[PDB]
Design a protein around this ligand. Structure first.
Ligand code: 237
Ligand code: CA
Ligand code: CA
Lengths: 50, 234
């Protein structure tokens, strides 16, 4: 997790000497196990456009 | 906010404003979810009864995007003391849920270890509010934001006339005339990481505003993550 946040979008943990990414409430971890996808409208921490 | 810039449309959607009986703002807050608001404990001993306004950017004209919410439960940290300003944190449960929309969205709550290692080690954070734009000035009519550098802990312990506890952290500039101020208290201090903003602090206090050799003091959210989680379930 020390190298570019383990390539994680948000939370990064080093379980068993291996990167494990996770996300904040309202987001689901993408298939690649790194990106965080908003589960719906107005996800936390995002500036609003509309 | 002294200095800084005006929050443009949709830039500070997690900002909440505590308003008194006169519908006048006196403190800020951070939207955590549709039912919860994060603020400073000292802001509670600063008004009889109050409500929470979200979606506002200009306290003068009525945009139509603003919304007022009554407070159902006030959860103030039992250890807060006006004597040390330590444990300056409170959580508010609203009577009705907030409707997210343009200018209304929650800031993300981060995990403790990750936040301390990845967020607070960042170069800067962002503070926002409707507070005074000058130490002796008046309450700001427009919502403003300011990028504040994280300050070395030893650096500000030396700069403070008061004890800086482990529940506090400093941010701002030593000599540059930019800082949060009275009226911004209870408001958000967020840190951006890969285009996502996480709440990292609560505007708490400072000796004057934007004064040389002095910094802004904020409640360290990471020190209360478990307390916040518990408050949000009850
Ligand atoms: C004079 O300052 C004026 C008035 C007001 C204020 O009340 N200050 C303020 C509060 C608490 C303590 C203190 C802290 C620890 C232990 C004991 C005390 S004590 C015995 O109560 O003095 C010190 C202080 F200066 N202020 C701001 O809060 N402004 C501001 C707020 C947030 C930020 Cl990020 C930057 C600026 C500007
Ligand atoms: Ca308005
Ligand atoms: Ca200063």
């Amino acid at each position: 997790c020390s190298l570019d946040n383990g390539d994680c979008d948000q939370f990064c943990h080093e379980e068993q000497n291996s990167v494990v990414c996770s996300c904040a409430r309202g987001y689901t971890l993408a298939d690649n196990g790194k990106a965080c996808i908003p589960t719906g409208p107005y996800p936390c921490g995002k500036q609003t456009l509309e | 906010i002294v200095g800084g810039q005006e929050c443009k449309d949709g830039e500070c959607p997690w900002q909440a404003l505590l308003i008194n009986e006169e519908n006048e703002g006196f403190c800020g807050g951070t939207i955590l979810s549709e039912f919860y608001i994060l603020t400073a404990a000292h802001c509670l001993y600063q008004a009889k009864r109050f409500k929470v306004r979200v979606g506002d950017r200009n306290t003068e004209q009525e945009e139509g995007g603003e919304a007022v919410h009554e407070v159902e439960v006030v959860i103030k940290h039992n250890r807060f003391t006006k004597e040390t300003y330590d444990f300056d944190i409170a959580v508010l449960r609203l009577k009705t849920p907030i409707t997210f929309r343009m200018n209304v969205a929650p800031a993300c709550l981060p995990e403790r270890d990750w936040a301390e290692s990845t967020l607070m080690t960042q170069k800067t954070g962002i503070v926002s509010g409707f507070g005074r734009t000058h130490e002796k000035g008046r309450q700001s009519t427009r919502l403003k934001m300011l990028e504040v550098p994280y300050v070395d802990r030893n650096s500000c312990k030396l700069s403070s006339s008061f004890i800086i506890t482990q529940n506090m952290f400093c941010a701002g500039y030593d000599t540059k005339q930019e800082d949060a101020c009275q009226g911004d208290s209870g408001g958000p201090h967020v840190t951006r990481f890969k285009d996502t903003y996480f709440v990292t602090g609560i505007v708490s206090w400072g000796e004057g505003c934007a004064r040389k050799g002095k910094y802004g003091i904020y409640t360290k959210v990471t020190a209360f993550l478990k307390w916040i989680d518990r408050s949000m379930k009850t």
